[PDB]
Amino acid sequence: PNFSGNWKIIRSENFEELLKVLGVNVMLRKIAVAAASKYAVEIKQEGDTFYIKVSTTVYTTEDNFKVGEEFEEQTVDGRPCKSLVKWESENKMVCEQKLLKGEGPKTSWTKELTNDGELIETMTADDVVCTQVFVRE
Numbered sequence: 556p557n558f559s560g561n562w563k564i565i566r567s568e569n570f571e572e573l574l575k576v577l578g579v580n581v582m583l584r585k586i587a588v589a590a591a592s593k594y595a596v597e598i599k600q601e602g603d604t605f606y607i608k609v610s611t612t613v614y615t616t617e618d619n620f621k622v623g624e625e626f627e628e629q630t631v632d633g634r635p636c637k638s639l640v641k642w643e644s645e646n647k648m649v650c651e652q653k654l655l656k657g658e659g660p661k662t663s664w665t666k667e668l669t670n671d672g673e674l675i676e677t678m679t680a681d682d683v684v685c686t687q688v689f690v691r692e
């Protein structure tokens with residue numbers, strides 16, 4: 556049992572405050588928080604190669620990477636960035652991002668497989684950490 560599976564969110568904490576740090580106005584933050592209640596993640600892991608598909612009711616993106624190899628994605632607020640994933644431990648990885656253009660808050664994410672079958676994702680902007688918890692569908 557590795558990261559592979561179809562994961563459905565059961566809990567999201569501090570997501571609105573993450574988007575506030577990132578400059579989203581209140582009305583869209585509330586609509587984004589509602590959209591995150593349908594957040595789903597599909598993972599296929601082969602070694603340190605990861606295929607990820609993150610989706611909501613009306614949107615879906617893919618985001619494939621290999622640990623230790625730089626790649627391009629977008630920050631949570633949508634700005635292009637270059638990213639590098641490393642292991643922290645057997646079942647936790649950390650990704651550091653650097654903006655491709657301009658400046659902005661410092662952003663990163665983590666994924667972790669817990670002993671109790673949960674997937675925990677965090678997303679960070681400066682001081683503020685959002686935590687989302689998933690279970691296998």
Ligand SMILES: *C/C=C(C)/C=C/C=C(C)/C=C/C1=C(C)CCCC1(C)C
Nearest residue numbers: 587590591594609611618630631666
């Ligand atoms: C390893 C995990 C990854 C690459 C996931 C990143 C997640 C996002 C960029 C999520 C963004 C969201 C919005 C901007 C609006 C509300 C719904 C979300 C959670 C899909």
